[PDB]
Amino acid sequence: GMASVLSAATATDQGPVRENNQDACLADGILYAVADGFGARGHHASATALKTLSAGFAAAPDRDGLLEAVQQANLRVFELLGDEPTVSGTTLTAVAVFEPGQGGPLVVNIGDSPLYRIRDGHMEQLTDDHSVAGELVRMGEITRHEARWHPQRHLLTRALGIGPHIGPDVFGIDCGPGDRLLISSDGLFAAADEALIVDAATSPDPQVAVRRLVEVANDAGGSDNTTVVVIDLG
Numbered sequence: 001g002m003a004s005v006l007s008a009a010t011a012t013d014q015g016p017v018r019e020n021n022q023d024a025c026l027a028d029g030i031l032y033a034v035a036d037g038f039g040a041r042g043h044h045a046s047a048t049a050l051k052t053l054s055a056g057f058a059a060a061p062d063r064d065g066l067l068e069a070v071q072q073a074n075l076r077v078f079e080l081l082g083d084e085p086t087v088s089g090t091t092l093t094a095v096a097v098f099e100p101g102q103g104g105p106l107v108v109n110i111g112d113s114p115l116y117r118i119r120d121g122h123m124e125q126l127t128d129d130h131s132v133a134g135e136l137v138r139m140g141e142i143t144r145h146e147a148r149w150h151p152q153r154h155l156l157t158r159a160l161g162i163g164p165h166i167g168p169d170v171f172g173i174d175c176g177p178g179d180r181l182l183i184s185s186d187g188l189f190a191a192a193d194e195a196l197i198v199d200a201a202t203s204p205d206p207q208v209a210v211r212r213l214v215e216v217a218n219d220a221g222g223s224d225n226t227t228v229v230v231i232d233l234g
Ligand SMILES: [Cl-]
Pocket: 018, 019, 020, 021, 022
């Protein structure tokens, strides 16, 4: 029988507008993550968060261990950047594709780098965005569709590395054989046509998918860094 993860691919692209690529991604065994950094040291924040997350998960690759790795990542980034004249930090969305005996796949997320599931040709967002716009969506006041270009979607309400305490969302992922997961930074949906994003995301080869997703985002203007992780499940 099949493993829970069949294959995965990642891509990151600075795009033609931003002066730095402050996004980072991770694909490490059953652990996958995207971190979207912000601020003068946003690159430092996202890279340090993922380095720390990877190390912590390796030392304790279970649900509690993943949560304590996210706490560790928060503290490490805060210790390194918290002293700076301006605020820098990062989002973090991590997925651990645990087998059923370890509770099944788990998402831990902070900020606005979403997790999507692609099932039967549909792509749906599984996570809450911790932004001003994300709160409006939660309450039913705007659609997700609406929210992608809301003037306040860039105002984060949770981030890693900006203080000593964080409360990420933590939930199991309802997924199974044939499903695909996509973790992305917000840059993917900054401007491109949703149908075109789904077309790219559904490309049979995950390595083609991630390249097409970066191309779609850049063709549409590439206003932000775009980073994607595609995971095919078994
Ligand atoms: Cl930048």
